[PDB]
Amino acid sequence: TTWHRPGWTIGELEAAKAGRTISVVLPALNEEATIESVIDSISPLVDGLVDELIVLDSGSTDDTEIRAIASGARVVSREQALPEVPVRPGKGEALWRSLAATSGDIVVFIDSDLINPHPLFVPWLVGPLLTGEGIQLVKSFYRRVTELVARPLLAALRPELGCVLQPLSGEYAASRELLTSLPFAPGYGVEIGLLIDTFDRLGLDAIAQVNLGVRNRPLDELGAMSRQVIATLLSRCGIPDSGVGLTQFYTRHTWPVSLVDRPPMKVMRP
Amino acid sequence: TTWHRPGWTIGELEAAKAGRTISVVLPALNEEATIESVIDSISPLVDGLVDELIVLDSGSTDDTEIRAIASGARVVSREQALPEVPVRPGKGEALWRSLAATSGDIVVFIDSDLINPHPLFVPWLVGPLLTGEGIQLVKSFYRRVTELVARPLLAALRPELGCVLQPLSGEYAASRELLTSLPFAPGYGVEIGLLIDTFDRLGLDAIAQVNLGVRNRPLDELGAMSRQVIATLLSRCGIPDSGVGLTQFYTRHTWPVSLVDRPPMKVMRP
Ligand SMILES: O=c1ccn([C@@H]2O[C@H](COP(=O)(O)OP(=O)(O)O)[C@@H](O)[C@H]2O)c(=O)[nH]1
Ligand SMILES: O=c1ccn([C@@H]2O[C@H](COP(=O)(O)OP(=O)(O)O)[C@@H](O)[C@H]2O)c(=O)[nH]1
Numbered sequence A, B: 001t002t003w004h005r006p007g008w009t010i011g012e013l014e015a016a017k018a019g020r021t022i023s024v025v026l027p028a029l030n031e032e033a034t035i036e037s038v039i040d041s042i043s044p045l046v047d048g049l050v051d052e053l054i055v056l057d058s059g060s061t062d063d064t065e066i067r068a069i070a071s072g073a074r075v076v077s078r079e080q081a082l083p084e085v086p087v088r089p090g091k092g093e094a095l096w097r098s099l100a101a102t103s104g105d106i107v108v109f110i111d112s113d114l115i116n117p118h119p120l121f122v123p124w125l126v127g128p129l130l131t132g133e134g135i136q137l138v139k140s141f142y143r144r145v146t147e148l149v150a151r152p153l154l155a156a157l158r159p160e161l162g163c164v165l166q167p168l169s170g171e172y173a174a175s176r177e178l179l180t181s182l183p184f185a186p187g188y189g190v191e192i193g194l195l196i197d198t199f200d201r202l203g204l205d206a207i208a209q210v211n212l213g214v215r216n217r218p219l220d221e222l223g224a225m226s227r228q229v230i231a232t233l234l235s236r237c238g239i240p241d242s243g244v245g246l247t248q249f250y251t252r253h254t255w256p257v258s259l260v261d262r263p264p265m266k267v268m269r270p
């Protein structure tokens, strides 16, 4: 179901959580310009509704770590998250590793690139989870790879999902149980994979969708992001993807594409 | 092979044509603003290199027909092209019907929306056909659904084709033999279908690619165009496409998608 209008209060939400804990992950790669306002918008909730918040630094070479530390956030490196396993590039890798660095019964994911996030994003996302039943994933929407790639593709291969307005949204929450059960697609495939894998396994009903209000990058990427979105999506649907990277044109350049998911994190914690 | 630099002259090209005729099709739906300059850029060639040029009017309700008639072009309606078969919406329908209205051994397709086309487009497209051998299709490139949908998708499902810079280009030429052999995908699928169907059947070598120099619409469409591009492409690759139209969001709207190709025009002319 879909909440076009969120309206729980931090106090009632905190109430309804009934012993379950809530972690918050901000994945960040070189986001020094926005990282502070993102953290700051959520800071106050910590020790109340939110029990834990960390920044997953995916190898920033700018001032992201220091700015975030200055805003009172725990910063975890991909290496710190899971020391025993060498590190892979891409967003999916970081979201995956973040599971090992957190312990909330509920994990909320919020991108670090957001321009002045609303302080009610977390409580709005965590809404259906705390007050509903059998909701395990809640995606957000607001206001493109999403409108030209992901959404047409779902109409074609998983139309039951063509009602998701933002399949690729970086802002969503889920139970720890579901996320540890699932593989994690590499790079920019992670979001579309979790959507399909959750649907395929729990049905359209474990999935909520909430309005977050209102809302970038070069066509150089995007092409690349689109490619991986296609590979993850094709794979979840039983279509063999070639493995070949998108080539951009003179002169030539081939962006990397990965057909390798991470296993469910359950596996790694025996 | 790829001509990064075209350099035949109307006189030598005309020479090399050795009895083969050349038709030119401008499909047009409501293009009153550009139709004249497109025709005008090609007019002079008629009775020389080009033997026949027509405008395929796909039901314009503006002044396209009259402007084009005023520029000395034959205008054919979809109905006139093939009276005996009721008319379907979409670009593919019009390109298909145009085969019945022409008789050149070589058909050249040029979009009617082009801003001040170069007068050497036709001769550059028809180049490899007239002076090469075993080239049956030549696509153009210059300077997106193309960069986010069509091109990533070909990397994934027909990577041998990921070297085409403009899979979706509206400017291309082909032998009458090849085009009558092929089915024609509906609407905005027509281009991607002909590319795949030609490759699958004649190999990467019957296909040329020429530089045409240098170079629009709302994300409302595009979404829709992307969808049909996905359905035609999925179908050529043996993937069952759901048949479900892309739904846009409040409030709702579902754009049409077609899984129905036209049969090879050979069939219709017994
Ligand atoms: O290797 C990584 C690790 C993390 N992130 C982070 O994950 C989020 C999504 O990145 P992006 O904004 O580029 O995705 P988009 O919204 O552009 O599709 C951001 O907060 C990133 O810094 C990333 O893009 N790549
Ligand atoms: O039902 C039809 C019949 C013809 N055309 C024509 O075919 C070409 C391609 O249309 P468009 O420029 O919209 O394609 P785009 O380059 O935007 O992907 C144009 O000259 C159109 O007027 C069309 O789009 N739809």
Ligand SMILES: [Mg+2]
Pocket: A111, A113, A170
């Ligand atoms: Mg982002």
Ligand SMILES: [Mg+2]
Pocket: B111, B113, B170
């Ligand atoms: Mg056009």
